[PDB]
Amino acid sequence: GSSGSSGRSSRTRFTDYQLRVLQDFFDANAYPKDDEFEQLSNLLNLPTRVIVVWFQNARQKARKSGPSSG
């Protein structure tokens, strides 16, 4: 099969302007539907596919366990 070349191989970098809306929309909602995703894609002018991958991960990083409190 494939030796490696694993990861994202997307080469997509967002700017504060975009990260602001993307991160802002996540802090409020991280489980939006296609209809919603479009709102961001139309504003940032980015493909939902790109916003999805970003939102998906953001969730994984958010999940944490341990002696953490707050």
Curated annotation (Swiss-Prot):
| Superkingdom in the source lineage | Eukaryota
Residue intervals passing through the bilayer: none
Q: In which tissues is it expressed?
A: Not found in normal gastric mucosa but found in gastric carcinoma cells (at protein level). Expression is higher in ER-positive breast tumors than ER-negative breast tumors (at protein level).
**DNA-binding region ranges:** 8-64
From the Swiss-Prot or TrEMBL record, state where the protein is found: Nucleus; Cytoplasm
Q: How is it modified after translation?
A: Hyperphosphorylation protects ZFHX3 from calpain/CAPN1-mediated degradation. Ubiquitinated, leading to its proteasomal degradation.
**Which cysteine residues pair off into disulfide bonds?**
none
Associated pathology: Atrial fibrillation, familial, 8: A familial form of atrial fibrillation, a common sustained cardiac rhythm disturbance. Atrial fibrillation is characterized by disorganized atrial electrical activity and ineffective atrial contraction promoting blood stasis in the atria and reduces ventricular filling. It can result in palpitations, syncope, thromboembolic stroke, and congestive heart failure. Spinocerebellar ataxia 4: A form of spinocerebellar ataxia, a clinically and genetically heterogeneous group of cerebellar disorders. Patients show progressive incoordination of gait and often poor coordination of hands, speech and eye movements, due to degeneration of the cerebellum with variable involvement of the brainstem and spinal cord. SCA4 is characterized by the onset of balance disturbances and gait and limb ataxia usually in the fourth decade, although earlier onset in the teens or twenties has been reported. There is evidence of genetic anticipation within families.
Q: Its function? A: Transcriptional regulator which can act as an activator or a repressor. Inhibits the enhancer element of the AFP gene by binding to its AT-rich core sequence. In concert with SMAD-dependent TGF-beta signaling can repress the transcription of AFP via its interaction with SMAD2/3. Regulates the circadian locomotor rhythms via transcriptional activation of neuropeptidergic genes which are essential for intercellular synchrony and rhythm amplitude in the suprachiasmatic nucleus (SCN) of the brain.
Q: Summarize the subunit comment.
A: Interacts with FNBP3. Interacts with ALKBH4 and PIAS3. Interacts with ESR1. Interacts with RUNX3. Interacts with TRIM25. Interacts with SMAD2 and SMAD3.
Descriptive protein name: Zinc finger homeobox protein 3
Species = Homo sapiens
